[PDB]
Structure formats: structure tokens, C-alpha cells
A paper describes a structure:
A map of the CDTb trimer was refined to a final resolution of 4.19 Å. Although the nominal resolution of the final map is lower than the initial reconstruction, the final map does not suffer from problems arising from preferred orientation as is apparent in the initial map. The model of the dimer was used as a reference to generate a molecular model of the trimeric intermediate. We note a similar arrangement of Chains A and B within this structure and the presence of a third chain, ‘Chain C’, positioned next to Chain B, opposite of Chain A. As observed in the dimeric structure, the orientations of all three chains are rotated compared to the assembled, symmetric heptamer with an observed rotation of ~40° about the central pseudosymmetry axis between Chains A and B and ~43° between Chains B and C. The interface between Chains A and B and Chains B and C mirror those of the dimeric intermediate and do not indicate the presence of additional recognition elements. Interestingly, a helical pitch is also observed within the trimer wherein Chain C is positioned ~4 Å out of plane when compared to the symmetric structure.
CDT is a member of the Iota family of protein toxins which also consists of two homologous toxins produced by Clostridium perfringens (the Iota toxin) and Clostridium spiroforme (C. spiroforme Transferase, CST). All three Iota toxin family members are assembled from two polypeptide chains termed the “A” subunit (CDTa, Ia, and CSTa) and “B”, subunit (CDTb, Ib, and CSTb). All three B subunits are presumed to contain five domains that are involved in regulation (D1), oligomerization (D2 and D3), and host recognition (D3’ and D4). Once proteolyzed, the mature form of CDTb forms a large heptameric, soluble structure referred to as the prepore which binds one molecule of CDTa to generate the toxic moiety, CDT.
Residue numbers in the entry:
A (entry chain A), B (entry chain B), C (entry chain C): 218 to 315, 319 to 451, 457 to 748
Write the structure that this text describes.
């Protein structure tokens, strides 16, 4: 009944209960949780919960831009715009205006490549920390390029450079947005950096892209003509960096400064975008919120969620766990003990978790006092980053199985599993996968969980690839997570085999195969 | 009941008790110092205790820009933004448009080099003075570049400059903000100098740095590619300073004018950065407050703290000691006679303290009248500069120890130390520190405390390095600080030996290895 | 109770006493002189008692711009900012772009030299005039250049100019303030004058400095690089003034028009520096107040003080003596008959006094009626000039003794002196001040005081340098002041010795060696 800020919601209704229906507010008592309403938690000392250019009421009632994704309806998630650039096809030509020698290659893009390229994986997880530590960190602003149609052939012999003069570089790019915010006056700048030696900067101005970029969309609408670097003209190169591109290095294409406008609803009609810009709220959002990234193999997402700092009892901001923040940022359905997306389950054992050194140290220090030793029950703190990687293949010996092949010697008849059932081991367990279903020249990690109700039972696991290896595993009464890496090669090679031999008592569950990054090719 | 300024704070409270909770002001009754609540002190004759454009009650209540660091909510420390610029790597090319001969070297930038370069060392420290002096004083505005990847070769061999015509220089620079204040419309003017001779200046304008610079964050957000000086275009060089650069001197950068605005709330809604400027409060802050700089091996900070004019009893402003100023300006947990950060310990006998000549004369005048003979229990006066250097290696034979190796023949079972334990001696004390963990071409100070309740039980020390020496240290009844210096070379040498032997009675404590400056390399 | 001006202070409290506490005026009764309180007097017929744009209550209550030095707190001293430009490095280039024959020399600036460059000395100082007479006056605005690092070589040798065309000049400059006021919007216009001929006018606009120059703070803040004039650009020279610098003349720099703004606190918040100009108050101060310039070996000071016109009984204004005017315009500590700074002594017999011819005539008119024979007890009048030059060396055989070389035959066992003791003489008196501290190509004056309690005891003095001089002196009953002059030469000369021989009865006191100006050099 008491009001502090300039919002219709009372200060008592800004904590421990929040329901918005027919443009008024009513208290939640847990009767209509199935009827399409979710619980909002917000500040009650400040009008603006996060740094987005809206009040808490307008983003909790739908009276804002229709282009904004609906996942930012909760007041702890703000509309933060990100503009990313992807590189698709490359051509090399010896002229400047546009005869000569022109060569063309196709190239795939990887958004979450530089983040996980500095991840070293050990053979054993210490205590309840079921994650890895990266070396460096980066958002999806930068992008990585991998050459697919790379037959053994030097790039020099197709261009005939002798001593000093080198050709030019032309390409096609696409402009995507990974976040819950559009941009209207899109003016980005992008550096084309090859292993540190900067080549050029690209500014696409305004008229070439148009007055909008809706979230989740690019300018080439799905499958159409990609935008080339012809229509600020062409990029040169010298006779020092071509061998670097040929042998080991890949072209980095990263967006540096992003400027634009947006829309706020006026009193009368449709949107306005003239006297307002995205230039002041970058540090207003980025200095109070964390950064949660999710990487499905088809598309990626990033969100920013406000957090709580421990050394300020006067700051009465909402406090969440890790899993609650994931649920509110990404949108999920709560099943019995589990959190689901539309088709991909989300759990501390079903996907992979990546943190930097500060977050890893904070989680290791904060997991001492808890008595459950689970990842999702970690208190949210500001200034940390989470990268969730969805496996490209995952089975849980249950209703979900996306493996293209079928396993051998599978015994579903068990009930002492971490989630449901498990496989009773008696002898061999073998699977093979053809090379065509896996992208060449990458790095894969195969991970799983094991349990043994004996003293000194042991398992051996053989991974047959272009570096085949055999490894030894000694499980105990507790659940043990194992993870082993392997490398792939070109499509003209053999299949990939996964075998494991035991003594006939252990149990296995939660099998996953996940791609991380790309390996250099000898060229 | 009584009021003096245009603020909400009562007059009878404003001295010796001050607490903000739930946007109300209550006195201090020294019973909730453990729940995170803290006290502050403010002048009662003016609304702005410091020189910032925020009132003290507002800047202590949190109703201000949230990107400012949370320890700046102390009203006794003002917000002051500092912009620094420095190289990462350097290139020379003989063409104005970009073939020819091009060389590239990789450098490292350092923040406190010109300040420490005028500091001399001695065998003993007379009286209670536990600090050194510097020839000239500079802030962290200027940066020094050190060239690492450089074997024996002159720049002329890779350039072939004969009589007068020289090549062109280009560099990769970064911009950083080490202070408790952001700025938005950044317009830095930077002189790129070689030992006094200004080669040129650069004006970054707006399109290359961006409309934002968060405090504590560089221009590339954490790890991205460094900006190149290709987007006013190029700067020249002649064949007079090339060999001068070759022999002894290094390129320095300093900014001169930094223009920008500060952000604040409007009457109704969002924040505006239009009708403000960070150019009218620089002198008004610098002519009222002190200057305290801290330099950790990872990062650096500096603050301006207001002081009391002792020769003016009318100016009713609160007074400070040195340790209380450090605690209130940086933010530190106060253990029993101890100031701790999250991991770095600071005390009067664990760090290095640097003043200039005027502060040295003032502290020598004010030290004799004190009955405790310590550095921290000194009243703060305006217009004096303090620098604190945290050593890269430091131990006290206690809970804190981060040496890359382990000390030999340690008898820590003792209590007669400055803080608990001490190193009893019966035989030698040796360490062989390897060069793989130390920066090449540096100057290092070995510092420590010696004490012995005996007549003349002297000790001797031997430092084996590229400049090897032996020294004799005699003890006293008092507690004597011993400091010595040595120099190092490139990474392809043998280990550095520190050996000390006495006669089985002396006590040695608080052993520290720190770095000062860079030596000119012969090339 | 009775009020005249726009101040809360009554007319009676505006005379013979002025104390302020808790923003309330109170009268002086001589019990709180030792508690830091100071006594002022102010006009009671105008709101602005001085020409600075502040009323007496506002300039005495501290509620004004804090960058103004505390010496301007009293109402009888005006806030007058002065911008001076100094030249440090002279480089000559024969091109209009940047290749060519370039020569770079180092040069030191002298601020107050031309005001005292035309002074001549006398053997005896007649009557009670213990000062000197100058031929021209100059502020700290003009500045002179003196070249030290210059071996035997013509400037034409480094340029090889034959008949018709000479090179271009380029300079390194610094900007300083010496006054009790800051200006923000600096507009410096300067002329580079060469012995009556104007070479060029330099206008450094707004962007080469910015809107901040603190008083007493150089634009390169303490130790940084000198600012070159390469950021309106170039200055030519002919083959007529190029040979004039070789023999006798020196390049001089004189600012002509400077304007700025003074910052005023508004009603509610911060300070405004837009609607203002430092052009309507220059003639308000300069046409009323006098001029006092003080020259220390480390810094210079300039102040303007309002005086009394003796031919005006209607003009009711404060009347000041010379010593009280100095004490109010600088801030002084009063020992028993003595005026001291923190360490620099100032007195009628401890420094050098320079007066203009009109001022000397007025003072010599005023000296006859005085019955005390002291120069500091003279009533001030509008439009007179005072220069106080502190000698670089000064002894009095007392608490202050800062000669680097000790005397010979020192007998301090005496008490019939002007202050404290006097040096008893028995035979010769020797001093040998060496090469290592004397600035070259300068002119020095050694002055002293003598008594002799005998009828016809004469003394002899010898000054041995490259230009030696002998002299015979006859002292008298009272205090007699004598002054001698000499010059110096380059580094490769010998040390300078001073001998004085008496006969055992004469008494010598207050020996002061000072520098006056610079001599032309043969080259
Ligand atoms: Ca509210
Ligand atoms: Ca709210
Ligand atoms: Ca299961
Ligand atoms: Ca107050
Ligand atoms: Ca106040
Ligand atoms: Ca200890
Ligand atoms: Ca009055
Ligand atoms: Ca008055
Ligand atoms: Ca005396």
C-alpha cells in the first residue's frame, strides 16, 4: 500500500510476491501458476531495476517495442544489444577496381570459438566442481573462420607472387544480433585482424543495411544472397601475412565499437527513434550485471542479469541461484527436479560449464560451506561470466537419444541412476560413428558419469581416431565424471570408434559428445 | 534539529557519527561495525566535502552513477578520472602509404617508471624514517615502453638509412582508465615524446575510441586486438633520434588535455551527459586534496583524498592519519593492527613507501615529536604525494607466503616477532630463484628486517647475479631495515643466488623482493 | 548596528579589527593572536574593497573558489591572474614542412631580469635610502632567454647561410601563472621580440591548452616534456637579425593581451564559467592598486595592493606601511622585530630592494621626516612599484647559515649586534666558493653591513675571480651598507674567492650574495 518510486506497484509488492494481470497488480498465492504467469523479483528503492531505458512497470506489462524478445519481461533481465559479424566466402584477386587471377573458398563461422580455445581439460574433477577453467574470455562479438573445402594446396601457387607485390582480399559478410534488443541506426565498425597484425577496418555506414535489425535476424533474410565487400572499397595485404594464413593462423573478424538507436513508445502512436541513442547505457548495464551465454550447435544466445554484491547490506537487490538466473534469462519449464528448454534439457550434468579464473576461484571458495555440493546452488555475484555449451550429441539412457548410430550391449534394467535408469555393464560396450556426420578438423570431448559399488573395480576406454588412445578408469562408490578429448580429420578417412571394457558390475550414465574448437591444418 | 548546508544531514551528527540506512540518517553508536555498516566524516560548513559535483549525502546514499566504483561512495574521497595510453608493439616501415623494408618489435608498457627512476638506495635508514625519496614526481598518466623481443641487432641493419632520409613509425596503443570516475565524450590529446623532443601529438577525437570508457576497463574490453594508428594518419622520425633510441632512451607517452562529461540523473527519468564537463573540477580538486597512489604488480590505482590545513583553525574540516586515509581511500579489512585486501597485505613494514622532497621534509619534521616512532600515526596535510609499491615476492613466515620456492632451514616455532612468528637461525639461509619467473632487464630491491639482542653478532649476505656482491650487516638493539639492490639480464642465464649467514643468534623477518625500474640495454 | 555597504558587517567592525568565525564577524581584543586568527581592515564606502570581483565578506568567509590561494583571503589583496610564457629549447630548421640542417640548443628562462637589468651600484649609500634605482620597469609577463650549452661556434656555422635566405625557427614553450587567481578560458597572445624588432605574434587559441591553468602550476605539470609549437605554425628570419644574436642580444618574449573567466558558485549547485570575462576588471585593479613583485630562486610572486592617496581627505581607505603590506600580501610570521617565511627571511637588511625612479623620488621625499631611519615604515600610495629580490646566499652569524663553504676566523662570542650576535674580527677572513654551483655568464653583487668602534680603522677587500677587484673601505660609528659587483665565466674557470682583512676591532654582519642579470658573450 506504500509507494516509493514512480511506479504503480507498491513497495511491499516489489518483494516476495508479484503478479501483473489486466494492466493491474495482484499478489501471488500459488493458484494460477499453470495459466501463463511467471514470478517477477525487482528492486524497491530504485525506479529502474536494470540499466535498460525502461521502468520496471513498462517491461512487466508489455507496453514497449514489439521487436524486443519476450524473454526480457522479467525485471532482472535487460535489453542489451549486441551486433556480431560473420564471414562466409572469401575471394582473392590481384586487381584493385574489381582482368586477373581470382580464387574462391567457402568458410564456416564459429561464434563461441575464442572463448573455449584456451580451455584445458583434466582427467579428474576435484570435489563438486564439475566445470573447467578458460585462459581468456570473449563474448560472441568476435567470430572465428574455418576453411572447409581445404584440399592440400598452397595459396601462393594459385596467385604467382614472386618478391614484393601481393594481391587484395574480398569477401562476403553477414550482420547478426545475439540478444534481446534491436538496433535501428546501425553503424558498426569491424577490425579484420590476422594474428595481431591489423589489416583494415570496415564501416558499412547506414544506407547499405537499412533502418532496422530485428533480434534473432540478419540482413540476408535466411537463405538469400549474402552481402559482399564491394558495395570502404577493398582490402590490401603484403608478402608477410599470407604464409601465416596458409600455415596455422585464421582470420579474426571482430566488431569493436557499436552505435545505434532504439524505440520508445510515445503518447499517441508508433515508435520514435530520433532523440535517443545507445551510447550511455552500455556501462550502466555492464557494470551491474553478469553475462550468461548459451551455445546450442545451431544458434547462440547471450543475456545480462543483475546480481548482488556481498559487501553492501543496504543494497536490497533480488538474489538468485545460478539455475534460477539461467531459467529467468533464457526461459525454461520446471519439471520434477529438472529444467527444460523446448527440446534440449538443461542440467549440471547434461551440458558443459565454462567459467574464467575469477569465477572459478569464487565458486571453489563458496562451495566449501554448502552441504549439497551442487553447482546450481551457488549464490549470484556481480562481475562473473558463465558459458554453457550444449553437446552436439547427448544420451541419458532414457526417452532422449540423438545419437545417429545405436550402441551395443545396452541393459536399461536398472534404477540406481542419477536421473532415472542406467546401463548394466557385463562386457564390452561399443559404438561407431561415420566421419560424414562430424565436422572435419575440430576438437571433440566425450564425457560421462560412472559408479561402482565395489572396492577396486576398473574400466578401460579406447577411443579410435587419428590419434587412437586407451585410458584407465578406477571408479568408486561415488559418482565420477570422466571426460576425454580427441581430434578429427578430413572426410576421406575412416570412422570413429568408442569402446569400453569392464568387469561386469559398474554403471554408466549421462553420455555426451561436445565440440569445442578448431585445429590448424598443415597447408 | 540544526542545519547548515543544503543537505538532509543534521548538524549535530555530522562530526563523529554518520550512518545511512533506508535513505535515512542515524548516528553512530559503535555496535554494528560487523554487519557491513560503516561510518564516515564530512565538513559541516559546505555541502560538498570533496570537490566532486555531488553532495555528500547523495554520494553516500548511492543515488548516483552506478559505474563508479563502490568505495568512492566514501565522501572523503573524490571522483577523479585518469586516461592513460601505452604501446603493445612497434613497427617501422619506409612507405608513407603503408612496399619496402618493415620491422616489428614487441614491447610491454609500464605505469610507474619515471616516478621510481629518481630513487636511490642506501645500506641503512636513519631514525624512524622508513621511506625513500625521488628526484622527480609523476602520476600514472605517463607510461614507459620496454622492448623485450630484441636480440643483438641495430635498427639500421633492418632499415638501411644512410644520411638524412628516415622511415616512418607506427604503433599499437591501448587506452585505460585507472580511477573512480568514467567519462563519455573522450577527447584525449597525447604527446609521443623521446627524452624531451616531441615527435608528434595525436588527437583521438570520437570515432576511434568510442563514446564510453568504463573505469577499470581498457578500450578493448579485456582481451581483444590492440588498436592500430591507421585510423592523424602517420608521424615521422629522423636519423638523429634513431641511434639515440638504440643506445639508451625509450619512447614515452603522456596525455596533456583530457576532455569529457560526467553522467547524472535528470529530474524525471534517464541519465544525461550533455550539459556537463570534466574540465571545471580538475583544478578545484587538485588544489584541495592529497594524492595517494598504489601499485600492485597486476594493476594500479590512485586517489585524491581531502586533508586539513593545520594553519587555519577556522577551517573546520576533519583530520586523518595515513593508515586511516589508506583504509578509507582504497577499501581494506582491518584485522588486529593489519590492513588486508582480498589477497595483498599492506602495513608499515610490508610494502615500499615513496615520497618527494617536500613530503620527506614535512615527515622528518613531524616524526620527531611523536612518541611512538611510526609512519602511519601522522596527521595528513594537504599537497603531499604518497606512493605505495607492493613487492612481487614477500613473506613474513606466517599464514601469508607466495614465494616460487621454499625457504630452507626455517624455525618458525617462535613468538618474538613484529607480527607473531620469526625466523630463528642456527645455520645458513639459501635460495636459488630462477630467471623463468622474473622479467628480464630489471632492477630489484631485496628488503628485510633484522634484529638481535646481542652485542656484535654480525651477519653477511651474498647476492650472486650478473652484478654479484657481498655485504656485511651488523645488528643493533633496535629493529633495523636493510635494503640492497641488484640487476638482471635476459632469460637465457643461470639462476640468481641469495645467501645469508650469521652466527646462530640473529632474527630475520619480513623478506621482500620488489622491482623498481628498467635498465638501458646495450644494442 | 550601523551599516553602509552591501555586507552584514557594521562600519565600526570594518575598522581597527576584523575577525571571522562561524560565518559571523567579531572584534579583536588581543587574546586569540596565537590561535591562528588574523586582523584585517577594509573600506566602508564600497562593497568591493579591492578590485577583485568579490565582496569583503565573501572573500573573507571562504565561500568562494577554493583554487584561489589563501594569501588572497584578506580583503586588502586583490585576485589578479598573470599568464607568462617561457622558452626552453631553441631548434633551427631550414624547411617549411618539418629534412634540413637543424640545430637544437637548450635555454633557461629568466622571469624578473629586465626590471633589474638596468641597475647601477654605488660605493656608499647616502642617507636612509638602502635600496637601488632602476631605469625601467617590467612585470613577470616579459621573459628573457639565456643559452648555456653553447661552445665556441657561430650559429651561421651550423646553418651555412651565405647571402640571401635564412632558416626557420621552432621552439619549446611552457605556460605558467604567478598570481592569486585562476583563469579558465585562456586566450594567450604573445610577441617574440628581438631587440626592438617584432619577429612574430603567436596565438595559441583554446585547444593547445584547454580551460584550466592553476595559479603557480605550469602547463606541463612539474616534470614532463616541454610543449613544442608544432601543434600560427612557423616563423621566418632574415640575414640581418641572425648575426645580432651572436654578439650581445637575446630573444625576449612578451605577452600582450590575455583574457579569461573567473568561476563563481551559483545559487544551487556547481560553478559557471561561461557568462564571464577577465576584461572588465583589469583596469579596475591596475589603475588603483600598486605592484609588489617578489623573486625567489625557485619561484616568483606578483601581487597588487590598494593604497591611500595622501592628497585626498575625502577618500576613506585603509592606510598601510611597507612591511605590513608585504605581510598581508604574502602571509608572514612575525618574530621579535623580524619577518619570516617558512624558511626565507625578508627584512630591510636581509634582501635586495628595487624601486622605480618615481617611487624612489617619492620615498626619498618621505624619508626625511621620519625619525627612525627605517625603510619599511613608509606609508603606501597608489601607483608605486616594489621589487624584493631574495639573495641566493645570505649569512648573519645566527640561526640561518646556509653557505656551502665555511668561513675563516669565525668569532661568535659577541652581543652588540643588530639582531643577536656579530662576528668579531681579528685578522684575515677567507672564503672560496667553488665552480660546482655557480650559474655561468651571470652578474653577482655581494653586500654587507659594518661597524667599527674606532676613529680611523680601515679595512681592505679583495674579490678574486677571472675579473678580480681590490677596494679600500672606511667604516663609521653606525651601520654602514656596502655593495660590490662581479661576473663569472664558463665551467673551465677556477673557483671564486672573497677576502676581507681588518685590524681586529671592526664588526661585520649580514653578508648577502645575490644575482642581478646576464652579460653578453663573445661568440
Ligand atoms: Ca516502488
Ligand atoms: Ca522498482
Ligand atoms: Ca539415467
Ligand atoms: Ca551537512
Ligand atoms: Ca554538509
Ligand atoms: Ca613474521
Ligand atoms: Ca560593512
Ligand atoms: Ca567593505
Ligand atoms: Ca646578527
Amino acid at each position: 500500500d506504500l509507494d516509493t518510486d514512480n511506479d504503480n506497484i507498491p513497495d511491499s509488492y516489489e518483494r516476495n510476491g508479484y503478479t501483473i494481470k489486466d494492466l493491474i497488480a495482484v499478489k501471488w498465492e500459488d493458484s494460477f501458476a499453470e495459466q501463463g504467469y511467471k514470478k517477477y523479483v525487482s528492486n524497491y528503492l530504485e525506479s529502474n531495476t536494470a540499466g535498460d531505458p525502461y521502468t520496471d512497470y513498462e517491461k512487466a506489462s508489455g507496453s514497449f517495442d514489439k521487436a524486443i524478445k519476450t524473454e526480457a519481461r522479467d525485471p532482472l533481465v535487460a535489453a542489451y544489444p549486441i551486433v556480431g559479424v560473420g564471414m562466409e566466402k572469401l575471394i582473392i584477386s590481384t586487381n584493385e577496381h574489381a582482368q586477373g587471377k581470382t580464387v574462391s573458398r567457402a568458410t564456416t563461422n564459429s561464434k563461441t570459438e575464442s572463448n573455449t580455445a584456451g580451455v584445458s581439460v583434466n582427467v579428474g574433477y576435484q570435489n563438486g566442481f564439475t566445470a573447467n577453467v578458460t585462459t581468456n574470455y570473449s563474448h560472441t562479438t568476435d567470430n572465428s573462420t574455418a576453411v572447409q573445402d581445404s584440399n592440400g594446396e598452397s595459396w601462393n601457387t594459385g596467385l604467382s607472387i614472386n618478391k614484393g607485390e601481393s594481391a587484395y582480399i574480398n569477401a562476403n559478410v553477414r550482420y547478426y544480433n545475439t540478444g534481446t534488443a534491436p538496433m535501428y541506426k546501425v553503424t558498426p565498425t569491424t577490425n579484420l585482424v590476422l594474428d595481431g597484425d591489423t589489416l583494415s577496418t570496415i564501416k558499412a555506414q547506414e544506407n547499405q543495411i537499412g533502418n532496422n535489425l530485428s533480434p534473432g535476424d540478419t540482413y540476408p533474410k535466411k537463405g538469400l544472397s549474402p552481402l559482399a565487400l564491394n558495395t570502404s572499397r577493398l582490402i590490401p595485404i603484403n608478402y608477410d601475412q599470407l604464409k601465416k594464413l596458409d600455415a596455422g593462423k585464421q582470420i579474426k573478424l571482430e566488431t569493436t565499437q557499436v552505435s545505434g538507436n532504439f524505440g520508445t513508445k510515445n503518447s499517441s502512436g508508433q515508435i520514435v527513434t530520433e532523440g535517443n541513442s545507445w551510447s550511455d547505457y552500455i556501462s550502466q548495464i555492464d557494470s551491474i550485471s553478469a553475462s550468461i551465454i548459451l551455445d546450442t550447435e545451431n544458434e547462440s544466445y547471450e543475456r545480462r542479469v543483475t546480481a548482488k554484491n556481498l559487501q553492501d547490506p543496504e543494497d536490497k537487490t533480488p538474489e538468485l541461484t545460478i539455475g534460477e538466473a539461467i531459467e529467468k534469462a533464457f526461459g525454461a519449464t520446471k519439471k520434477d527436479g529438472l529444467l527444460y528448454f523446448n527440446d534440449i534439457p538443461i542440467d549440471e550434468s547434461c551440458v558443459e560449464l565454462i567459467f574464467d579464473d575469477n569465477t572459478a576461484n569464487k565458486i571453489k571458495d563458496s562451495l566449501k560451506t554448502l552441504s549439497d555440493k551442487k553447482i546450481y546452488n551457488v549464490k549470484l555475484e556481480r562481475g562473473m561470466n558463465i558459458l554453457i555449451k550444449t553437446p552436439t550429441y547427448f544420451t541419458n539412457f532414457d526417452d532422449y537419444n540423438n545419437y545417429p548410430s545405436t550402441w551395443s550391449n545396452v541393459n536399461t534394467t536398472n534404477q540406481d541412476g542419477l536421473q532415472g535408469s542406467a546401463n548394466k555393464l557385463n562386457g564390452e560396450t561399443k559404438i561407431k560413428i561415420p566421419m560424414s556426420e562430424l565436422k572435419p578438423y575440430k576438437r571433440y570431448v566425450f564425457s560421462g558419469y560412472s559408479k561402482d559399488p565395489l572396492t577396486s573395480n576398473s574400466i578401460i576406454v579406447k577411443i579410435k581416431a587419428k590419434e587412437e588412445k586407451t585410458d584407465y578408469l578406477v571408479p568408486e562408490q561415488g559418482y565420477t565424471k570422466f571426460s576425454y578429448e580427441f581430434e578429427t580429420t578430413e572426410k576421406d578417412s575412416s570412422n570413429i570408434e568408442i569402446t569400453l571394457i569392464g568387469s561386469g558390475t559398474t554403471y554408466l550414465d549421462n553420455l555426451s559428445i561436445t565440440e569445442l574448437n578448431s585445429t590448424p591444418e598443415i597447408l
